[PDB]
Design a protein around this ligand. Structure first.
Ligand SMILES: Cc1cn([C@H]2C[C@H](OP(=O)(O)O)[C@@H](COP(=O)(O)O)O2)c(=O)[nH]c1=O
Ligand SMILES: [Ca+2]
Length: 129
């Protein structure tokens, strides 16, 4: 897998963001995670955590997995990095997302993320509190 450039256009919520990628606006959905909807417990905190991480970044990057790159809604499916730190993993490590939507062939970072989840759960953070 390879990191590629993108620029933030707008925060959306805990697991989607609008980025400019190869010069075109796209919505991206984070691979391998699910955050609560803005209306549910920890929804606002997930959205805020993601928004801060991505707006404070100097450099956003997108990393596609080996499989599908857009979903049925036309959202890009990627791992997103903010100054080299994976947003998908950070949300999980903080108890603000669960590992989810693990489809065969787009699951390169599955174990990394499950390890984060286990640490969050052991710490009783947020969703696991
Ligand atoms: C994360 C992810 C979601 N999806 C689809 C499955 C779900 O379909 P349904 O909309 O039919 O439930 C939806 C979940 O996204 P959201 O959590 O953003 O709603 O996105 C994929 O197809 N691939 C993926 O990798
Ligand atoms: Ca969601």
């Amino acid at each position: 897998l390879h990191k590629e450039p993108a620029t933030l256009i707008k925060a959306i919520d805990g697991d989607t963001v609008k980025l400019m990628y190869k010069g075109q606006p796209m919505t991206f959905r984070l691979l391998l995670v699910d955050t609560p909807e803005f209306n549910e417990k920890y929804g606002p905190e997930a959205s805020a955590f993601k928004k801060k991480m991505e707006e404070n970044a100097k450099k956003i990057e997108v990393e596609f997995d080996k499989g599908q790159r857009t979903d049925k809604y036309g959202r890009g499916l990627a791992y997103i990095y903010a100054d080299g730190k994976m947003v998908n993993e950070a949300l999980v490590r903080q108890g603000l997302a669960k590992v989810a939507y693990v489809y065969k062939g787009n699951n390169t970072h599955e174990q990394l993320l499950r390890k984060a989840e286990a640490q969050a759960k052991k710490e009783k953070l947020n969703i696991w509190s």
